[PDB]
């Protein structure tokens, strides 16, 4: 497999302006007729090179003349000797039922559906499968009326007909030119939830949510979230929907989360279906996030698209930013920020320290499906957020406005977007652009001094990004570094110098620089990198008392949680070292006291309390260490939980009871109280065994919603309580017919601390609710084991690696995209001890030797073994 490079981008030799597609649909053999109007822009002797994969070519015509001047090559149809303007007609066959990779046209249960991003359209017909080729689509679909009574594509229905032999047809037209990755087709039988949204300016939009027969009871929340997204984009960004119909189709078989195809989004059912007995608070908020996300792409991705796939973050960073802003505006901003920062520090930093490290705008890609990453998405969003921090909301919105004014109806670049922001705001972003080109996590080191003679506070701030596998050269970045200074009363000290106020967002642009502040009337306690103002690791020599002071006094709830994290980091590191020496947990009394104070604080937002009382995950803990000891981390997390459970037992039970709610509401105040109650339950489960077992069993049985039931079940598994096996069996017996609900149970099985967890996981490959044919099931059992049970995955006998090799040997052939998702824990080998590295290396070497190794896995394996 050959790498492609960003610097090799060149405008296409040919454009296509219009394409008329006909599908004669059948699961075994679908016939595609594609009539394209093409224009040559390149040299008169340049051939037209069409991408195509796994197509059976039937005929090629140019202006209705059977064409003799063509050849098929690997992945392509090369057509020579063309006029400047012409009509290309391709007829070819494909086989949806054979498509186990779920890219192009495939089968999802009884439905046929498409996934074209990034390069799936070339699995449907021979085309210019590149996002800088925008064309106006019409789509005619012909199918069996009984099997496929709904035939959907992008845009509006313009024609329909009936045929003999029980077939019918519908034709769709989408007026907006689009790259082919935004093409969608769906055929099947569905229940349909229909509603309406009227835009600010009065455009009535028909909303249609297509779900499998019998699932209408699970559709209203997704519909509500769609309307909420539409309203918010109007209010916040001044953007209205631009078509007459908005369709969403929920499908069970889908490699990612959801897809923004123009006017016809296709969603993994996990991000659509919810009822209070099947879905948790987290599920509701994720449906809200993902519905919003795909909707927000209508402008940031569709109306302005990507010139090439190296510009993926142009749409993903910005749309992730938009979905975060949506969730934050509607819900708790602090909880959203906290959770997004957990993801950055615990998962994205890991990627940036791995063989797969890349800038948010990659320079080199072998398989583009490998670059739908934490970096491109979540770090991409942090980069957009830094622009927002530097510009402020008003200037940022001016930049958005200029971006659309310049680029609406075209494919643009990351650089185009930065230039629009810079031009609209008059803020210089020339240095800032380096965030697009440089991979790895910067480390920002802060030293301070207080001078009582002059009442000056001095911050000496340095930065460096360590070399990464992809880049030997690193340079200083433009780091927006937000600070606050607190006096002894917990009041904010005004930032000033030489009689003039100083902006609290410091521009850290050099390898080292000093900032001096005047009229600092008391030695300050600083809050540093406020609201995680740049995606960096902070090195500052905090005292415990500075941190507990911030937990008490910091103005922003994020800073209070972040202070608690810094406090915990010290003792997590202490206790991992102790575990390695065979010693039990040690924790100063004043540390437990800080968490007691959070429990008993009557003024603190329960949403914030809940997050402070949620310990960093084993993944967040891992990124505190150069060399990861996953067993020590797991056992320290448990020991810390047990210690706090014992020290805080009375307080935990009081707060658990105080936050009882008889009514279940998907409302932010209620969610906050419930998150706090369940955080308390988690500790209580690790307290005295009998009380724990009673409390957990009672909550599981008395729960009137899945949030509370799952919290209890999860605690029973985590703490290995007597009731565990009974509760797990009850859940299976009740829910086995419901895959999405069973995913939660497979996750609990996979992440179990039980000694026999791998045995159980292997056995579950035969479970009635499991199938290797379904990405969600695969991710919930196998993925959760490898990625979310590192203690078991990294068992010293190497059994975890061997299991993953076995699974990837199947998935490499079946569904390379899912295989590539699942190989990730194995490519982190350099973070582990020598003995583990050698076993993981052996595992990777076995995979490298697979017959018919997918490009997806090849790219990751070669980087890992380098
Ligand atoms: N474009 C989708 C993501 C996606 C990408 C590729 C896929 O195959 C599926 C989904 C989004 O981020 O909104
Ligand atoms: Na990276
Ligand atoms: Na100091
Ligand atoms: Zn997206």
PDB file of N, CA, C and O in Angstrom, residues 310-335:
ATOM      1  N   UNK A 310      -6.602  15.503   3.575  1.00  0.00           N
ATOM      2  CA  UNK A 310      -5.669  16.047   4.576  1.00  0.00           C
ATOM      3  C   UNK A 310      -6.301  17.230   5.328  1.00  0.00           C
ATOM      4  O   UNK A 310      -5.900  17.551   6.450  1.00  0.00           O
ATOM      5  N   UNK A 311      -7.314  17.852   4.716  1.00  0.00           N
ATOM      6  CA  UNK A 311      -8.046  18.961   5.352  1.00  0.00           C
ATOM      7  C   UNK A 311      -9.241  18.478   6.200  1.00  0.00           C
ATOM      8  O   UNK A 311     -10.105  19.281   6.533  1.00  0.00           O
ATOM      9  N   UNK A 312      -9.281  17.197   6.557  1.00  0.00           N
ATOM     10  CA  UNK A 312     -10.431  16.668   7.311  1.00  0.00           C
ATOM     11  C   UNK A 312     -10.806  17.507   8.544  1.00  0.00           C
ATOM     12  O   UNK A 312     -12.003  17.725   8.813  1.00  0.00           O
ATOM     13  N   UNK A 313      -9.798  17.946   9.298  1.00  0.00           N
ATOM     14  CA  UNK A 313     -10.055  18.754  10.498  1.00  0.00           C
ATOM     15  C   UNK A 313     -10.785  20.073  10.214  1.00  0.00           C
ATOM     16  O   UNK A 313     -11.471  20.617  11.084  1.00  0.00           O
ATOM     17  N   UNK A 314     -10.651  20.601   8.991  1.00  0.00           N
ATOM     18  CA  UNK A 314     -11.414  21.790   8.585  1.00  0.00           C
ATOM     19  C   UNK A 314     -12.896  21.619   8.915  1.00  0.00           C
ATOM     20  O   UNK A 314     -13.533  22.551   9.412  1.00  0.00           O
ATOM     21  N   UNK A 315     -13.441  20.439   8.626  1.00  0.00           N
ATOM     22  CA  UNK A 315     -14.839  20.161   8.993  1.00  0.00           C
ATOM     23  C   UNK A 315     -14.972  19.488  10.363  1.00  0.00           C
ATOM     24  O   UNK A 315     -15.930  19.764  11.087  1.00  0.00           O
ATOM     25  N   UNK A 316     -14.045  18.603  10.728  1.00  0.00           N
ATOM     26  CA  UNK A 316     -14.228  17.855  11.980  1.00  0.00           C
ATOM     27  C   UNK A 316     -13.887  18.654  13.234  1.00  0.00           C
ATOM     28  O   UNK A 316     -14.657  18.619  14.200  1.00  0.00           O
ATOM     29  N   UNK A 317     -12.746  19.339  13.242  1.00  0.00           N
ATOM     30  CA  UNK A 317     -12.382  20.203  14.389  1.00  0.00           C
ATOM     31  C   UNK A 317     -13.491  21.226  14.628  1.00  0.00           C
ATOM     32  O   UNK A 317     -13.962  21.412  15.753  1.00  0.00           O
ATOM     33  N   UNK A 318     -13.918  21.885  13.550  1.00  0.00           N
ATOM     34  CA  UNK A 318     -14.911  22.950  13.658  1.00  0.00           C
ATOM     35  C   UNK A 318     -16.291  22.405  14.039  1.00  0.00           C
ATOM     36  O   UNK A 318     -17.012  23.005  14.848  1.00  0.00           O
ATOM     37  N   UNK A 319     -16.664  21.256  13.486  1.00  0.00           N
ATOM     38  CA  UNK A 319     -17.984  20.683  13.838  1.00  0.00           C
ATOM     39  C   UNK A 319     -18.017  20.083  15.249  1.00  0.00           C
ATOM     40  O   UNK A 319     -19.031  20.192  15.940  1.00  0.00           O
ATOM     41  N   UNK A 320     -16.907  19.473  15.675  1.00  0.00           N
ATOM     42  CA  UNK A 320     -16.766  19.045  17.082  1.00  0.00           C
ATOM     43  C   UNK A 320     -16.877  20.253  18.023  1.00  0.00           C
ATOM     44  O   UNK A 320     -17.619  20.191  19.021  1.00  0.00           O
ATOM     45  N   UNK A 321     -16.160  21.333  17.702  1.00  0.00           N
ATOM     46  CA  UNK A 321     -16.285  22.585  18.467  1.00  0.00           C
ATOM     47  C   UNK A 321     -17.763  23.010  18.562  1.00  0.00           C
ATOM     48  O   UNK A 321     -18.274  23.322  19.649  1.00  0.00           O
ATOM     49  N   UNK A 322     -18.445  22.996  17.426  1.00  0.00           N
ATOM     50  CA  UNK A 322     -19.858  23.348  17.386  1.00  0.00           C
ATOM     51  C   UNK A 322     -20.718  22.408  18.244  1.00  0.00           C
ATOM     52  O   UNK A 322     -21.563  22.883  19.022  1.00  0.00           O
ATOM     53  N   UNK A 323     -20.503  21.091  18.147  1.00  0.00           N
ATOM     54  CA  UNK A 323     -21.295  20.162  18.981  1.00  0.00           C
ATOM     55  C   UNK A 323     -21.012  20.372  20.486  1.00  0.00           C
ATOM     56  O   UNK A 323     -21.911  20.294  21.305  1.00  0.00           O
ATOM     57  N   UNK A 324     -19.771  20.716  20.827  1.00  0.00           N
ATOM     58  CA  UNK A 324     -19.416  20.981  22.237  1.00  0.00           C
ATOM     59  C   UNK A 324     -20.106  22.260  22.732  1.00  0.00           C
ATOM     60  O   UNK A 324     -20.616  22.323  23.853  1.00  0.00           O
ATOM     61  N   UNK A 325     -20.106  23.284  21.888  1.00  0.00           N
ATOM     62  CA  UNK A 325     -20.757  24.558  22.220  1.00  0.00           C
ATOM     63  C   UNK A 325     -22.274  24.390  22.373  1.00  0.00           C
ATOM     64  O   UNK A 325     -22.883  24.965  23.278  1.00  0.00           O
ATOM     65  N   UNK A 326     -22.861  23.583  21.499  1.00  0.00           N
ATOM     66  CA  UNK A 326     -24.277  23.221  21.550  1.00  0.00           C
ATOM     67  C   UNK A 326     -24.588  22.551  22.885  1.00  0.00           C
ATOM     68  O   UNK A 326     -25.435  23.031  23.655  1.00  0.00           O
ATOM     69  N   UNK A 327     -23.879  21.462  23.180  1.00  0.00           N
ATOM     70  CA  UNK A 327     -24.087  20.728  24.427  1.00  0.00           C
ATOM     71  C   UNK A 327     -23.870  21.612  25.655  1.00  0.00           C
ATOM     72  O   UNK A 327     -24.639  21.546  26.637  1.00  0.00           O
ATOM     73  N   UNK A 328     -22.832  22.443  25.599  1.00  0.00           N
ATOM     74  CA  UNK A 328     -22.466  23.327  26.717  1.00  0.00           C
ATOM     75  C   UNK A 328     -23.514  24.416  26.948  1.00  0.00           C
ATOM     76  O   UNK A 328     -23.830  24.740  28.096  1.00  0.00           O
ATOM     77  N   UNK A 329     -24.050  24.975  25.861  1.00  0.00           N
ATOM     78  CA  UNK A 329     -25.075  26.013  25.978  1.00  0.00           C
ATOM     79  C   UNK A 329     -26.346  25.420  26.555  1.00  0.00           C
ATOM     80  O   UNK A 329     -26.909  25.966  27.506  1.00  0.00           O
ATOM     81  N   UNK A 330     -26.790  24.291  26.008  1.00  0.00           N
ATOM     82  CA  UNK A 330     -28.032  23.665  26.464  1.00  0.00           C
ATOM     83  C   UNK A 330     -27.944  23.047  27.863  1.00  0.00           C
ATOM     84  O   UNK A 330     -28.945  23.048  28.609  1.00  0.00           O
ATOM     85  N   UNK A 331     -26.760  22.540  28.211  1.00  0.00           N
ATOM     86  CA  UNK A 331     -26.565  21.765  29.447  1.00  0.00           C
ATOM     87  C   UNK A 331     -25.627  22.475  30.407  1.00  0.00           C
ATOM     88  O   UNK A 331     -25.632  23.697  30.501  1.00  0.00           O
ATOM     89  N   UNK A 332     -24.827  21.700  31.130  1.00  0.00           N
ATOM     90  CA  UNK A 332     -23.813  22.270  32.009  1.00  0.00           C
ATOM     91  C   UNK A 332     -22.533  22.525  31.237  1.00  0.00           C
ATOM     92  O   UNK A 332     -21.875  21.554  30.819  1.00  0.00           O
ATOM     93  N   UNK A 333     -22.146  23.795  31.091  1.00  0.00           N
ATOM     94  CA  UNK A 333     -20.883  24.096  30.417  1.00  0.00           C
ATOM     95  C   UNK A 333     -19.698  23.468  31.154  1.00  0.00           C
ATOM     96  O   UNK A 333     -18.823  22.870  30.521  1.00  0.00           O
ATOM     97  N   UNK A 334     -19.683  23.593  32.483  1.00  0.00           N
ATOM     98  CA  UNK A 334     -18.577  23.008  33.270  1.00  0.00           C
ATOM     99  C   UNK A 334     -18.451  21.498  33.072  1.00  0.00           C
ATOM    100  O   UNK A 334     -17.347  20.999  32.831  1.00  0.00           O
ATOM    101  N   UNK A 335     -19.563  20.762  33.136  1.00  0.00           N
ATOM    102  CA  UNK A 335     -19.501  19.303  32.969  1.00  0.00           C
ATOM    103  C   UNK A 335     -19.017  18.944  31.558  1.00  0.00           C
ATOM    104  O   UNK A 335     -18.172  18.064  31.384  1.00  0.00           O
TER     105      UNK A 335
END
